[PDB]
Write an enzyme that holds these catalytic residues in place. Structure first.
Site, PDB file in Angstrom:
ATOM      1  N   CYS A 163       0.819  -1.206   0.000  1.00  0.00           N
ATOM      2  CA  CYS A 163       0.000   0.000   0.000  1.00  0.00           C
ATOM      3  C   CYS A 163       0.846   1.246   0.000  1.00  0.00           C
ATOM      4  CB  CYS A 163      -0.891   0.025   1.263  1.00  0.00           C
ATOM      5  SG  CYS A 163       0.049   0.066   2.818  1.00  0.00           S
TER       6      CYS A 163
ATOM      7  N   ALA B 135       3.121   1.685   3.134  1.00  0.00           N
ATOM      8  CA  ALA B 135       4.356   0.913   2.998  1.00  0.00           C
ATOM      9  C   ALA B 135       5.356   1.662   2.127  1.00  0.00           C
ATOM     10  CB  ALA B 135       4.092  -0.458   2.417  1.00  0.00           C
TER      11      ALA B 135
ATOM     12  N   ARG C  13      12.038  -4.974   6.632  1.00  0.00           N
ATOM     13  CA  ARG C  13      12.822  -4.425   5.544  1.00  0.00           C
ATOM     14  C   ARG C  13      14.197  -4.062   6.082  1.00  0.00           C
ATOM     15  NH1 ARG C  13      13.067   0.835   3.124  1.00  0.00           N
ATOM     16  NH2 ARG C  13      13.748   0.734   0.932  1.00  0.00           N
TER      17      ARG C  13
ATOM     18  N   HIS D 167       5.812   6.349  -2.501  1.00  0.00           N
ATOM     19  CA  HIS D 167       7.082   6.996  -2.896  1.00  0.00           C
ATOM     20  C   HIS D 167       6.851   8.467  -3.213  1.00  0.00           C
ATOM     21  CE1 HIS D 167       8.207   2.803  -4.719  1.00  0.00           C
ATOM     22  NE2 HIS D 167       8.292   2.805  -3.403  1.00  0.00           N
TER      23      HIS D 167
HETATM   24  S1  ICS Z   1      12.278   1.457  -3.613  1.00  0.00           S
HETATM   25 FE1  ICS Z   1      10.831  -0.136  -4.121  1.00  0.00          FE
HETATM   26  S2  ICS Z   1       9.438  -4.079  -3.442  1.00  0.00           S
HETATM   27 FE2  ICS Z   1      12.795   0.804  -5.685  1.00  0.00          FE
HETATM   28  S3  ICS Z   1       8.872  -0.405  -3.044  1.00  0.00           S
HETATM   29 FE3  ICS Z   1      10.110  -2.162  -2.668  1.00  0.00          FE
HETATM   30  S4  ICS Z   1      14.318  -1.308  -1.563  1.00  0.00           S
HETATM   31 FE4  ICS Z   1      11.570  -3.759  -4.085  1.00  0.00          FE
HETATM   32  S5  ICS Z   1      12.132  -3.857  -6.248  1.00  0.00           S
HETATM   33 MO1  ICS Z   1      10.816  -4.536  -1.616  1.00  0.00          MO
HETATM   34  S6  ICS Z   1      10.908  -0.207  -6.379  1.00  0.00           S
HETATM   35 FE5  ICS Z   1      13.352  -0.567  -3.418  1.00  0.00          FE
HETATM   36  C1  ICS Z   1      11.829  -1.842  -3.684  1.00  0.00           C
HETATM   37 FE6  ICS Z   1      12.337  -1.753  -5.563  1.00  0.00          FE
HETATM   38  S7  ICS Z   1      10.806  -2.427  -0.564  1.00  0.00           S
HETATM   39 FE7  ICS Z   1      12.569  -2.598  -1.954  1.00  0.00          FE
HETATM   40  S8  ICS Z   1      12.967  -4.690  -2.551  1.00  0.00           S
HETATM   41  S9  ICS Z   1      14.418  -0.813  -5.449  1.00  0.00           S
HETATM   42  S1  CLF Z   2      -3.487  -0.798   3.707  1.00  0.00           S
HETATM   43 FE1  CLF Z   2      -1.499  -0.023   4.546  1.00  0.00          FE
HETATM   44  S2  CLF Z   2      -0.918  -1.600   6.104  1.00  0.00           S
HETATM   45 FE2  CLF Z   2      -3.161  -1.891   5.691  1.00  0.00          FE
HETATM   46  S3  CLF Z   2      -4.228  -0.765   7.614  1.00  0.00           S
HETATM   47 FE3  CLF Z   2      -4.029   0.469   5.547  1.00  0.00          FE
HETATM   48  S4  CLF Z   2      -2.195   1.842   5.732  1.00  0.00           S
HETATM   49 FE4  CLF Z   2      -2.038   0.037   7.186  1.00  0.00          FE
HETATM   50 FE5  CLF Z   2      -2.844  -1.466   9.627  1.00  0.00          FE
HETATM   51  S5  CLF Z   2      -3.998  -1.551  11.671  1.00  0.00           S
HETATM   52 FE6  CLF Z   2      -3.966  -3.704  10.713  1.00  0.00          FE
HETATM   53  S6  CLF Z   2      -2.241  -3.619   9.164  1.00  0.00           S
HETATM   54 FE7  CLF Z   2      -4.237  -3.076   8.128  1.00  0.00          FE
HETATM   55  S7  CLF Z   2      -5.944  -3.809   9.484  1.00  0.00           S
HETATM   56 FE8  CLF Z   2      -5.409  -1.567   9.696  1.00  0.00          FE
END
Ligand code: ICS
Ligand code: CLF
Ligand code: ICS
Ligand code: CLF
Ligand SMILES: [Fe+2]
Ligand SMILES: [Fe+2]
Lengths: 458, 517, 458, 495
Positions: free
Chosen positions: D50, D53, D84, D183
């Site tokens: 989402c 995140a 992460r 982002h």
């Molecule tokens: S920011 Fe993006 S999903 Fe570019 S949300 Fe995701 S630390 Fe992936 S492919 Mo997790 S666009 Fe980084 C990514 Fe790539 S969290 Fe990391 S590995 S290079």
């Molecule tokens: S789409 Fe993203 S992670 Fe989902 S809630 Fe929404 S901002 Fe958060 Fe949060 S407390 Fe639990 S994990 Fe969800 S049901 Fe709500």
């Protein structure tokens, strides 16, 4: 910790340091405790009996009963005949076992005591009450090890007890080798899950892993019954688990009673447990049930899930030959490398089986030693390090001094509680081993990483 | 009657021999004659060990910079690998310490058939070249005499070649009837070949602690209090000892004898040879500690030492009094029995009695008649066939080193003031009327005591511990201290009490019966 | 490590740090995977579903399938009705579960989405094929915790499926609470050993602890079968293990189908396992077999054998209420002290139950907190230290920073392998707990003792 | 063909929307139009996350001396607690580091019904008084807008009272269709309220690395090589970053753009506002690394820096060449599929190809307020003069532009936008690849089927995978995975 151990290896041919074995008698004492209502008896000077009972209590955190002939300087000059006849009189009246299982010490063997003669003289004099039994084996401490002693006692049991009376029992004999009570329980569980009738002997489950009920029982509930030991001569087949501990008895039973036998590795890891299951299936036509196949698949699942922490890891292993052969194979199956592999028990077989599995896996550069000791391994480690150590309690010194992840395995383990409830055989036991191994590897990684390399998931 | 109940099940021949090993101390006979130091009845389930255990495992093993080589098959060596908890540290932080090793010749069939002397020779040289210790010990085991090995000659030949001492001990397991024979064998060689070989200068207020093996740090706790009062602890035989300290044992003014059974031979012989008097040391329990320290003060007769003695006693007691009060509140009214090797039974009974715990039966593995009834019976004792073989050493005064340490005038006044100089009255002297003592106690005996007296606790060793506990009765170990300690000294009373209260009040004791029963 | 935690405490009423709970929906997803051929469904924005699937995979090292309504900004205006209807069409056609178990997120709960209407509309429209089912519960993340989510999904299972048809099945229902698959296995093994027919629900054994066979199965062989979930209304009795996770379902079943219930503690430790076994015996008149009696007596033997290392040890525990209540009791049964005791899940019962057992054992000076967090416990430890920490993976920071022996327990454990094969319930589980506790205590002693205090026997 | 096998089982409406998301990239069409950045189909089993995140979990969280408060119920905070693997160390050994903590307002029913602004205000003050950080962040979650909380105003009021910056981010989960929207939300606020507030002195040969989060130590490895050559790494956004280094991101001469997807708004706005140009940074795999280093050298056009660049490259490759030959011997001939989030697909394919491994399918979860900047008066400057830019492009250096991930991949590669479980399983069944790289949700699904799946997000708890030493880590872990003996023991002997 172990300050005196030089790094540079000088030739050593007489001075034994920190052995990877002990002497025969405790192996026979252990076998004898695997017979129901049996008092083990040490025919020699009493120091032996006290030391042998002692190690069993330190390992199992349980009682370990045994009597002794208590040799003095008199017996050293005239032999121990009078001592053992006096013992037997006191044993049956004071303590009333159903069977007395006699082994010998370096003293009675150096003297050449004639136990078969003392035993038939006792029979004649009526010292052995009706329905009681006295059996023996010879266990010279200057030959082999405690494993040999266990093997010799199992032969004694078949020499005196096993009889083929024509009445087939439909059972398979299993001699589980020099393994713990939890391993005997697991081997039995697997027979029961395949639906295969059996007689296990010796069997120390319910003897050296027993409950506290508030009443002390000199002869605990477990142990193979005398009547079933007699019946081993009416079985269809004997499975001998671990050639060093078990073959002598299985071959003796074949000679004496015409029961064929099959030799199997102690069932530790994937291939050795698979070979044991296939033997049970082939001998009986019974199918492998879903429960057993699920456990195997869970082991495989774990092996794959945890694979990154195991691949290429160098392992030092010390112990008894049957167990260390099978465990070395499992180490290879895990993707790891048996680097230094030692047993104190003499014999060609170990060297051949380890060399062979190492060649099969492409592993060069490992050292394998028969009649090596902990000092050998420690010196080897100072020259080239390892990632993991597996041995009995006595490896803890090396483990601490060299900062190596350490898994307690084999005999004796005197410094942790509950190991006698934990199988190491079968798919269930293999799971336990992988947990222990990955746990100590991971613990080390986490103790030593910098804070900036700290990880929630692994 | 408990003696009668214990004896009843024995067959006639056995009953007759065992009856004399059980006595009761009474007001009518407070020092009853006991039969002791005889062979064990075969098959009766003893806790006794052998002479090699007494010699190597007990007396000699603790000398930390001497390589101890067991000449025998492997078990004799393996079973002396760390089971007995003598503690050692490297001298001045840097000296040799072999506590973590066991050494042996690992005798094979070829050595039995053809003799083992060549392998022993090679092993001694290998040890020397690898470790350069202060000295080497060679210890006989069961096969050694029988197969014809002359270890005395192998040792002397080696010593000349390598230039350090090599001491042979003929402690074959079957000699004597128990560990005791082993103590005697060790004392003989330590006396003739080690003590007095040094050249160090004697310090003021110098004492030795003899028959003290620093189990679980006991000796260091003793030394802590002795050094605070002002004494110089010259040597401890042999807990945490270096070889050179034993060699300088003659450099003291007073020998404290902690274990009389194991070290009395050296105490007597040092008095004859060097003029050094001894007193019994009782460093377990507040009463014994304090009496020992007061006895020492009176021997030295120094106004300062004496004042410091009282100040230190008062301050050490004050520091633990809250704990002592706790122990008594938690334990008083409970009952115990104890089972020891050859010493310590009255001090433990006394420590227990300071907590309000009464001791009903004291069992023993191998104490001699002089240990029970006092040395005054040593003239009446006659050595039976099984122990007559152990050499009796005789020493003569060293013309150049002998000294009158305490003049005979002062010796006479000390004994009148209640200080037992160079004497020992025995374990029973001190025990309460009604105490039952069992020499060479066995499994049968122990089980009758448990069933008939129902003690709250029965202190013993590792072979008996789980036997007793399976029956629901607490059994703390008096040899290994269940892997703690010290139990000696002022801090030891606290360690012992803490572990005892923790044991008694463990909740699982009351959960043994399941609720469906 | 965690250098920013002050030792001296300023009261926090708003900032939550390092929580000892997570939100309801993962608990509902876990309960749903305890149904055979069920696809759990997250009715909200897809980020939730991703996070909730992810933690289950990190904990079990297994697949964790779930679908989502994938709310966009549009749903924040017109509700999630159309999203779920579209989801259901895609789910049945692509993935073909036998049942879709829907739970909700803070987003759908905040919007007031009306699942019963959407479901009845899908029913009317024919989007749910013949023989397929859709069930739901409501799982607002701003109420309670993941444990509440589990409870709620269990109620949902009962609301939709349980039926009393008058045809008695002679079984006992057991709701095992928010416990792992190995615990579910052990509970079932005990029923079977007692010879007592039962239905367990949910049951994740065979779903989240399954084998690798070479073929991926989207719906694993395990899980309670739909037909048995319906049959729960025909049972004689329901055992609710752990009031927080299990009472709601059990009470809902009593009100809907007239099945009476008994509430028991999660069977961790001696008294709690004894209470479970006595409840089974009393409900059925079945005798307790020798095998279970032997297991208990082995636990007792261990607790006595290892007593010196446990007596008076101060313990910090954090986790979920049913588990921590029963584990605190066991800590007391071991002779140890629950010094700091915390759950992040709200409710009075935790506070009462713990206070009560501390007072029974004469223990004063302990701190117990409902809706506490790991930061709380860290601060308390800095003021007065402890001897042992028991918690999920997130305790490892405190363990390392304060040098405390550390036992992983509860949810989630993401940094060791095999825990999901290790029971913590019953006599068998209690043995494993005592082994783990005494191992970490002993490892620390040995790691930190001077060389001269080094020991072969313990 | 594969596209049609994947599409077959979708119901008609889903089939039609999903068709555009699967393309086969060939020599006839070197870069076919893919449909990207559309809503996820409900119930299809996506891997996407989402906007919260993307904002808190990905871009902002790595700022180590800023307290990141999640304004929501507990889960949003709990699921960003160490999963992460951005690595942080305290600055100069002494600075603040909150990596081991998660912070939340832990919303309850009363906050949903009556509003949570009062709880958020108290949580801000408690964090300030307890930790005295460089700044505080407030991150929205699903309920925040709906329940009427004005987090912008709450932040502004609290910042004025406490005297440090408090940044509010409206990253409610349902915004956009993927982590990508998050982002963008982070980039807007970082650009307008953080970048350029510093006043440190610019150093010589200064570069920034943008869109680099120091997963498993990646950024430290890339710094090692960059500083050896002689650059000064002014700022990494946001791996191991302090708040102050972000505030001083304008003090550089070149921006390297590692993740273009997550950081392009900042790259484009810094060029517009400060005149700092950027180039694509591809610091994964030997080819990418060396091309990156040779492009940076061309931009500074300094003869000594150019010479040291070649000297460093040669010795770095010489140090690992034996490892690279071993990986090729052990892996050549095998096949792979990959499944990434938004970036990195081609660098991993290139690295896999250097080992002789061919990549057949590349899947993605999601690769593709709107703010405007204008030149800072007191701070704009032309770093590279007008037609020096032209000289660089006619010599193969794409200065301040990016071609896209697809234009550089071999012909035949099939690409799947918003790949789902169904799609993945078709690929596994039809192509039977030896390995399938993905994330944690997919790893055990793939490995249950006897196929190796190494993670491309968490790096299976190792790393770095970037840089020269990263190639060796990746190859070593990959070989160890393929040659794990248990793969060949799956079938029991009674079958
Ligand atoms: S920011 Fe993006 S999903 Fe570019 S949300 Fe995701 S630390 Fe992936 S492919 Mo997790 S666009 Fe980084 C990514 Fe790539 S969290 Fe990391 S590995 S290079
Ligand atoms: S789409 Fe993203 S992670 Fe989902 S809630 Fe929404 S901002 Fe958060 Fe949060 S407390 Fe639990 S994990 Fe969800 S049901 Fe709500
Ligand atoms: S030496 Fe003796 S058996 Fe006096 S052989 Fe034995 S370390 Fe005992 S009662 Mo073990 S005469 Fe010492 C003894 Fe006492 S080993 Fe220790 S505790 S005080
Ligand atoms: S009474 Fe004493 S301990 Fe016994 S042997 Fe004799 S000296 Fe020794 Fe040794 S090797 Fe084993 S343990 Fe014996 S059977 Fe021989
Ligand atoms: Fe026990
Ligand atoms: Fe798994």
């Amino acid at each position: 910790m172990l300050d005196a151990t030089p790094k540079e290896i000088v030739e050593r041919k007489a001075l034994r340091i920190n052995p990877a074995k002990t002497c025969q008698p405790v192996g026979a004492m252990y076998a004898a405790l695997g017979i129901h209502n049996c008092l083990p008896h040490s025919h020699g000077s009493q120091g032996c009996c006290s030391y042998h009972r002692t190690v069993l209590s330190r390992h199992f955190k349980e009682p370990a009963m045994a009597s002794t002939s208590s040799f003095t300087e008199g017996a050293s000059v005239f032999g121990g005949g009078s001592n053992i006849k006096t013992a037997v009189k006191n044993i049956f009246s004071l303590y009333n076992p159903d069977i007395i299982a006699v082994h010998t010490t370096c003293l009675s063997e150096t003297l050449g005591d004639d136990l078969p003669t003392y035993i038939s003289q006792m029979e004649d004099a009526g010292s052995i009450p009706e329905g009681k039994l006295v059996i023996h084996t010879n266990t010279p401490s200057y030959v082999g090890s405690h494993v040999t002693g266990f093997a010799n006692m199992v032969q004694g049991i078949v020499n005196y007890l096993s009889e083929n009376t024509g009445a087939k029992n439909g059972k398979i004999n299993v001699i589980p080798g020099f393994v713990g009570p939890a391993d005997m329980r697991e081997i039995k569980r697997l027979f029961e899950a395949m639906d295969i009738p059996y007689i296990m002997f010796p069997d120390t489950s319910g003897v050296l892993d027993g409950p506290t009920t508030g009443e002390y029982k000199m002869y605990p509930e477990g142990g193979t019954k005398i009547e079933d030991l007699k019946d081993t001569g009416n079985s269809d087949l004997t499975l001998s688990l671990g050639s060093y501990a078990s073959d002598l008895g299985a071959k003796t039973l074949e000679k004496k009673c015409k029961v064929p036998f099959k030799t199997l590795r102690t069932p530790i890891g994937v291939s050795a447990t698979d070979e044991f299951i296939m033997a049970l299936s082939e001998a009986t036509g019974k199918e492998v049930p879903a429960s057993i196949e699920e456990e195997r698949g869970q082991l495989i699942d774990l092996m794959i899930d945890a694979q990154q922490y195991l691949q290429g890891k160098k392992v030092a292993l010390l112990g008894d030959p049957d167990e260390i052969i099978a465990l070395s194979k499992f180490i290879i199956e895990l993707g790891a490398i048996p680097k230094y592999v030692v047993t104190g028990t003499p014999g060609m077989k170990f060297q051949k089986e380890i060399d062979a599995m190492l060649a099969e896996a492409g592993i060069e550069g490992s050292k394998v030693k028969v009649e090596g000791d902990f000092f050998d391994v420690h010196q080897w480690i100072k020259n080239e390090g390892v990632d993991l150590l597996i041995s009995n309690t006595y490896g803890k010194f090396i483990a601490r001094e060299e900062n190596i992840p350490f898994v307690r395995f084999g005999f004796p383990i005197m410094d942790r509680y509950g190991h006698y409830y934990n199988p190491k055989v079968g798919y269930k036991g293999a799971i336990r081993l992988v947990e222990e191994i990955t746990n100590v590897i991971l613990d080390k990684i986490e103790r030593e990483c910098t804070e900036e390399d700290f990880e929630v998931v692994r | 009657n408990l003696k009668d109940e214990i004896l009843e099940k024995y067959i006639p021949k056995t009953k007759k021999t065992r009856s004399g090993h059980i006595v009761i101390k009474t007001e009518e006979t407070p020092n009853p004659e006991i039969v002791a130091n005889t062979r064990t009845v075969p098959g009766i389930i003893t806790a006794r060990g052998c002479a090699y255990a007494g010699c190597k495992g007990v007396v000699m093993g603790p000398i930390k910079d001497m390589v101890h080589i067991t000449h025998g098959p492997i078990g004799c060596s393996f079973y002396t690998w760390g089971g007995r908890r003598f503690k050692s540290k490297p001298e001045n932080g840097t000296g040799l310490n072999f506590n973590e090793y066991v050494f042996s010749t690992d005798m094979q069939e070829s050595d039995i058939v053809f003799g083992g002397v060549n392998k022993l020779k090679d092993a001694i040289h290998e040890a020397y070249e690898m470790f350069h210790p202060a000295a080497i010990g060679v210890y006989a085991t069961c096969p050694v005499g029988l197969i014809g090995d002359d270890i005395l000659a192998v040792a002397a030949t080696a010593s000349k070649e390598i230039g350090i001492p090599v001491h042979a001990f003929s402690c074959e397991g079957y000699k004597g009837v128990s560990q005791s024979a082993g103590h005697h064998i060790a004392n003989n060689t330590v006396m003739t070949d080690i003590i007095g070989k040094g050249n160090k200068e004697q310090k003021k207020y110098s004492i030795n602690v003899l028959g003290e093996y620093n189990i679980g740090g006991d000796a260091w706790e003793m030394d802590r209090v002795l050094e605070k009062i002002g004494y110089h602890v010259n040597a401890t035989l042999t807990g945490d000892a270096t070889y050179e300290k034993v060699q300088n044992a003659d450099k003291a003014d007073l020998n404290l004898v902690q274990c009389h059974r194991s070290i009395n031979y050296i105490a007597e012989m040092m008095e004859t040879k060097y003029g050094i008097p001894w007193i019994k040391c009782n460093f377990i329990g507040v009463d014994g500690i304090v009496e020992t320290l007061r006895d020492m003060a009176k021997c030295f007769d120094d106004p300062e030492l004496t004042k410091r003695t009282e100040e230190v006693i008062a301050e050490e007691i004050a520091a633990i009094q809250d704990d002592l009060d706790y122990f008594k509140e938690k334990l008083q009214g409970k009952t115990a029995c104890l089972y020891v090797g050859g010493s310590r039974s009255h001090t433990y009974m006394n420590m227990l009695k300071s907590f309000g715990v009464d001791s009903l039966v004291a069992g023993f593995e191998f104490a001699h008649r002089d240990d029970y009834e006092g040395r005054e019976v040593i003239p009446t004792i006659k050595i039976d066939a099984d122990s007559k073989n152990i050499p009796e050493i005789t020493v003569t005064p060293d013309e150049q080193k002998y000294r009158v340490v305490i003049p005979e005038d002062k010796v006479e006044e000390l004994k009148k003031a209640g200080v037992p100089l160079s004497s020992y009255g025995g374990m029973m002297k001190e025990m309460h009327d009604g105490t039952i003592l069992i020499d060479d106690m066995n499994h049968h005996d122990m089980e009758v005591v448990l069933e008939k007296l129902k003690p709250d606790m029965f202190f013993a060793g590792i072979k008996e511990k789980f036997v007793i506990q399976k029956g629901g009765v607490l059994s703390k170990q008096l040899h290994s201290y269940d892997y703690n300690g010290p139990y000696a000294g002022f801090r030891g009373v606290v360690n012992f009490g803490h572990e005892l209260v923790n044991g008694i009040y463990t909740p699982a004791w009351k959960m043994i019966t399941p609720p469906w029963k």
